[PDB]
Write an enzyme that holds these catalytic residues in place. Structure first.
Site, mmCIF file in Angstrom:
data_model
loop_
_atom_site.group_PDB
_atom_site.id
_atom_site.type_symbol
_atom_site.label_atom_id
_atom_site.label_comp_id
_atom_site.label_asym_id
_atom_site.label_seq_id
_atom_site.Cartn_x
_atom_site.Cartn_y
_atom_site.Cartn_z
ATOM 1 N N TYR A 52 4.881 -11.839 -1.787
ATOM 2 C CA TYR A 52 4.968 -10.918 -3.085
ATOM 3 C C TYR A 52 3.831 -11.319 -4.046
ATOM 4 O O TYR A 52 2.946 -10.692 -4.725
ATOM 5 C CB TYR A 52 6.224 -10.739 -3.607
ATOM 6 C CG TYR A 52 6.327 -9.986 -4.697
ATOM 7 C CD1 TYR A 52 6.364 -8.548 -4.899
ATOM 8 C CD2 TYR A 52 6.405 -10.611 -6.058
ATOM 9 C CE1 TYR A 52 6.343 -7.900 -6.075
ATOM 10 C CE2 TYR A 52 6.603 -9.908 -7.269
ATOM 11 C CZ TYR A 52 6.370 -8.330 -7.016
ATOM 12 O OH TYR A 52 6.451 -7.627 -8.349
ATOM 13 N N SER B 265 2.174 -8.593 -11.935
ATOM 14 C CA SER B 265 3.465 -9.463 -12.247
ATOM 15 C C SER B 265 2.829 -10.897 -12.300
ATOM 16 O O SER B 265 1.836 -10.964 -12.056
ATOM 17 C CB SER B 265 4.372 -9.701 -10.828
ATOM 18 O OG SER B 265 5.157 -10.850 -10.922
HETATM 19 N N1 LIG Z 1 11.530 -5.432 -13.297
HETATM 20 C C1 LIG Z 1 10.801 -6.502 -13.191
HETATM 21 O O1 LIG Z 1 11.618 -7.759 -13.320
HETATM 22 C C2 LIG Z 1 9.692 -6.683 -12.811
HETATM 23 C C3 LIG Z 1 8.775 -7.990 -12.709
HETATM 24 C C4 LIG Z 1 7.634 -8.179 -11.679
HETATM 25 C C5 LIG Z 1 7.275 -7.019 -11.153
HETATM 26 N N2 LIG Z 1 7.792 -5.790 -11.322
HETATM 27 C C6 LIG Z 1 7.232 -4.511 -10.720
HETATM 28 O O2 LIG Z 1 7.837 -3.217 -11.251
HETATM 29 C C7 LIG Z 1 7.422 -2.128 -10.158
HETATM 30 C C8 LIG Z 1 8.810 -1.324 -10.391
HETATM 31 O O3 LIG Z 1 9.796 -2.200 -10.002
HETATM 32 P P1 LIG Z 1 11.352 -1.850 -10.465
HETATM 33 O O4 LIG Z 1 12.211 -2.905 -10.731
HETATM 34 O O5 LIG Z 1 11.105 -0.366 -11.374
HETATM 35 O O6 LIG Z 1 11.885 -1.085 -8.947
HETATM 36 P P2 LIG Z 1 13.082 -0.850 -8.342
HETATM 37 O O7 LIG Z 1 13.933 0.071 -8.885
HETATM 38 O O8 LIG Z 1 14.126 -2.144 -8.191
HETATM 39 O O9 LIG Z 1 12.582 -0.079 -6.914
HETATM 40 C C9 LIG Z 1 10.951 -0.167 -7.039
HETATM 41 C C10 LIG Z 1 10.674 1.272 -6.512
HETATM 42 O O10 LIG Z 1 9.614 1.105 -5.317
HETATM 43 C C11 LIG Z 1 10.057 2.086 -4.389
HETATM 44 N N3 LIG Z 1 9.692 1.903 -3.088
HETATM 45 C C12 LIG Z 1 9.972 0.657 -2.324
HETATM 46 N N4 LIG Z 1 9.588 0.892 -0.907
HETATM 47 C C13 LIG Z 1 9.109 2.210 -0.972
HETATM 48 C C14 LIG Z 1 8.318 2.856 0.138
HETATM 49 N N5 LIG Z 1 8.394 2.107 1.211
HETATM 50 N N6 LIG Z 1 8.178 4.135 -0.206
HETATM 51 C C15 LIG Z 1 8.013 4.648 -1.370
HETATM 52 N N7 LIG Z 1 8.682 4.084 -2.360
HETATM 53 C C16 LIG Z 1 9.113 2.623 -2.266
HETATM 54 C C17 LIG Z 1 11.725 2.342 -4.509
HETATM 55 O O11 LIG Z 1 12.082 3.646 -4.270
HETATM 56 P P3 LIG Z 1 13.594 3.962 -3.526
HETATM 57 O O12 LIG Z 1 14.653 3.987 -4.656
HETATM 58 O O13 LIG Z 1 13.202 5.449 -2.728
HETATM 59 O O14 LIG Z 1 13.791 3.054 -2.196
HETATM 60 C C18 LIG Z 1 12.056 2.149 -5.857
HETATM 61 O O15 LIG Z 1 12.149 3.246 -6.734
HETATM 62 C C19 LIG Z 1 7.312 -3.091 -8.704
HETATM 63 O O16 LIG Z 1 6.090 -2.779 -8.469
HETATM 64 C C20 LIG Z 1 7.451 -4.488 -9.175
HETATM 65 O O17 LIG Z 1 6.567 -5.217 -8.351
HETATM 66 C C21 LIG Z 1 8.871 -5.563 -11.966
#
Ligand SMILES: NC(=O)c1ccc[n+]([C@@H]2O[C@H](COP(=O)([O-])OP(=O)(O)OC[C@H]3O[C@@H](n4cnc5c(N)ncnc54)[C@H](OP(=O)(O)O)[C@@H]3O)[C@@H](O)[C@H]2O)c1
Ligand SMILES: NC(=O)c1ccc[n+]([C@@H]2O[C@H](COP(=O)([O-])OP(=O)(O)OC[C@H]3O[C@@H](n4cnc5c(N)ncnc54)[C@H](OP(=O)(O)O)[C@@H]3O)[C@@H](O)[C@H]2O)c1
EC number: 1.-.-.-
Lengths: 252, 252
Positions: free
Chosen positions: A165, A152
């Protein structure tokens, strides 16, 4: 990254995706599948993984396997049992996308809640580390195993209200570099910073923001597709940005 | 950094030092004292802190206060009780040097031991975070509170056998930047990467190395002295190196 490839680009590639139940992980898993890959879904909630597997089935005719693993509480052994469970059904792993993540509090360090802080370190760094240790073998048994972490912009420069974070994403970068310079010509190991993307979690940290203004998990998939195919077979130890020149912030 | 100051440079400054029982922390505490500061020692072992306090007494005639705090297991509350205990005896804190650290395994990620990995995250990041949260108030009640973290070359670029430790130092850098850009003109917040220094812990990670070849905790004190006085009152959010241009590695 602009990148337009054969829908057989990942044809014989086995790829495990964490956080596959939602957001970017759900997208990446579905996209890998749609390009030939034999994808494995990881998450905590089984029903949410059933949903995803079923849609990939609708889209491609093959149904992916899921495994449950809760990064907040899983132990080293929990991670080894997983790798074992996998090992029977798969000869190896050609790719591992670590995408599961916890945001935790976006707020001043003074108000940052310690349990949450620690929860974020645990999922994003510690468990992410233990799972990659349990999976390192299966991966090494690939023609050219590809390992990518999720970073990020606040994993390159920390901003005011980010907290556990920001710290966790720096650690991710560090962890990637140690692994990269260590698996010299044995594996590719990089981070992707996806950038601000239209997911529930971006909503939560930016409620002001209008999601219609954001790019979409499908919109940034090129980079994910790249790091996993052969068009990248020599690049390792790097941090790729999905939306180069979007720059920090809300409005966009 | 070359820096030659009055032995009254820190004359009316209250400065808390963690890991004050040994290595660079012992050195920094003794040096602060020798330049006027009202120093507070933190560590886990009381006898080791008695030793240090007593020597500062021999050297300066004032005996510093010590407090016990075990970063591996202390809780958020443990840290608040501390700040309270401090608060009675001191109007504020003009400086906090976070120097306590755990190395953990130097070895391949494949062999890296998970408990140790987590132990390192806990001390270096999590507890370091909780203690700075408990101390943030006392510090803000200073004319110009100075907060410095301890980084390392593998907190800027991760190298093969460093592990939890590389990851923890990246997080340290991240944590410093969030705090720096957040306490804009209210506090100075920086890291020092001391560089390879002649301590028991450098010995442990480099047994080949000849310590006589290394610079000495007393040899790098200038930077520590700088960040704490007034000669630095406008600099914040930075990462200073004690041995600029020593470069990674063993022999030197
Ligand atoms: N989208 C953005 O603006 C952006 C910006 C910066 C960083 N990121 C990075 O993008 C990555 C994915 O983000 P996203 O927006 O696609 O995610 P998201 O849909 O909002 O959720 C993230 C995922 O992490 C999983 N998770 C959280 N806690 C967990 C646990 N304890 N055990 C197993 N799984 C767990 C969740 O599973 P569940 O549904 O089962 O809870 C979910 O599918 C992240 O690592 C984030 O840091 C994205
Ligand atoms: N010297 C170098 O080559 C160099 C290079 C890179 C980084 N560093 C950094 O320098 C800093 C200080 O290193 P050093 O060589 O001066 O240290 P050291 O003498 O080898 O030991 C470090 C200090 O950390 C304290 N500590 C460890 N675990 C603790 C815990 N659980 N609770 C409270 N205190 C704990 C120890 O206290 P006890 O004696 O009571 O156990 C000790 O005084 C570290 O943060 C390290 O990362 C130094």
């Amino acid at each position: 990254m602009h990148y337009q490839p054969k829908q057989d680009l990942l044809n014989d590639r086995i790829i495990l995706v964490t956080g596959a139940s939602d957001g970017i992980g759900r997208e990446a898993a579905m996209t890998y599948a749609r390009y030939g890959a034999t994808v494995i879904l990881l998450g905590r909630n089984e029903e949410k993984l059933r949903q995803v597997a079923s849609h990939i089935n609708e889209e491609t005719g093959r149904q992916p396997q899921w495994f449950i693993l809760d990064l907040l509480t899983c132990t080293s052994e929990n991670c080894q049992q997983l790798a074992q469970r996998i090992a029977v059904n798969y000869p190896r792993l050609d790719g591992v996308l670590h995408n599961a993540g916890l945001l935790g509090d976006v707020c001043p360090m003074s108000e940052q809640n310690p349990q949450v802080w620690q929860d974020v370190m645990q999922v994003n760094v510690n468990a992410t580390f233990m799972l990659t240790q349990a999976l390192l073998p299966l991966l090494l048994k690939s023609d050219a195993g590809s390992l990518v972490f999720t970073s990020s912009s606040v994993g390159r420069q920390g901003r005011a209200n980010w907290g556990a974070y920001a710290a966790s994403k720096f650690a991710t970068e560090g962890m990637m570099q140690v692994l990269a310079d260590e698996y010299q010509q044995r594996l590719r190991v990089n981070c992707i910073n996806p950038g601000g993307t239209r997911t529930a979690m971006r909503a939560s940290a930016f409620p002001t923001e209008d999601p219609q203004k954001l790019k979409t998990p499908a919109d940034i998939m090129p980079l994910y597709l790249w790091l996993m195919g052969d068009d990248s077979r020599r690049k390792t130890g790097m941090t790729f940005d999905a939306q180069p020149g979007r720059k920090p912030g809300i409005s966009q």
